[PDB]
């Protein structure tokens, strides 16, 4: 029974302040507001549209044990105990996220946050950071998280190149969708032990193949 693990925040308060500063710097660069939750804005999807029972083929449910861990991590972030992560600009990838301390295998990294909208409303959208929330049998019910105006660290995490022979080797975390109180939720979890300085990478095409990755480093 693989249990979700809470992250271990950097012990030095100055290291936590510096980490939080790199995220605030990147958000400011994209003219974004920090948001550690899913937001339901006007002219977009209402909170009522976000029901995991609409997921074609159903959605796995987050256990009480794993919800407790998720609540612990959320409460930790509220008081200033962020996961040990640094947002770093790279000339070949743009903004990237690296571990600024050890992250054990099965450790909760972050929830993918931003504005929830209908997929039907974003067919023409240029946002490079859209993440599937709900895939329904009727496509006009499907939802996407849009961190263009509001979001957190998750929108800055890099993806693997799905076309190269060795590109899968870079993956050290995974994005998963779970039902929490009957709603869809998107989370990032470590898939192996990650060392300080190690850049985070997950598979952007973990279910659909809607993200072009051929040119990825």
């Amino acid at each position: 029974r693989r249990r979700l693990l809470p992250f271990v925040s950097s012990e030095d308060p100055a290291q936590r302040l510096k980490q939080m500063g790199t995220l605030a710097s990147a958000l400011t660069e994209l003219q974004m507001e920090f948001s550690d939750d899913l937001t339901y804005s006007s002219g977009m999807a209402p909170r009522s549209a976000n029901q995991a029972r609409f997921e074609e083929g159903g959605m796995q449910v987050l256990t009480k044990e794993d919800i407790e861990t998720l609540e612990q991590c959320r409460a930790m972030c509220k008081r200033g105990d962020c996961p040990p992560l640094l947002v770093v600009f790279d000339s070949r990838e743009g903004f990237t996220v690296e571990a600024d301390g050890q992250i054990k295998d099965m450790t909760f990294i972050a929830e993918y946050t931003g504005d929830v909208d209908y997929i039907r409303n974003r067919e023409h959208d240029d946002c490079d950071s859209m993440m599937t929330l709900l895939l329904a049998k009727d496509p006009s019910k499907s939802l996407v998280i849009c961190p263009d105006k509001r979001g957190n660290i998750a929108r800055f995490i890099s993806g693997i190149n799905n076309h190269t022979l060795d590109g899968k080797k870079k993956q050290n975390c995974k994005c998963v969708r779970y039902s929490v109180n009957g709603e869809c939720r998107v989370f990032l979890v470590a898939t192996r032990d990650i060392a300080k300085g190690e850049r985070l990478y997950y598979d952007y095409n973990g279910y659909e193949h809607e993200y072009p990755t051929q040119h990825f480093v």
């Binding site: 693989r2 959605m59 796995q60 993440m131 993806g159 998963v176 969708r177 979890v189 952007y204 993200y211």
Partner: peptide
């Protein structure tokens, strides 16, 4: 043309 990241809804983490 819309690029979208996607994650599975089954199979757990590991």
């Amino acid at each position: 043309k819309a690029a979208r990241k996607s994650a599975p809804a089954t199979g757990g983490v590991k």
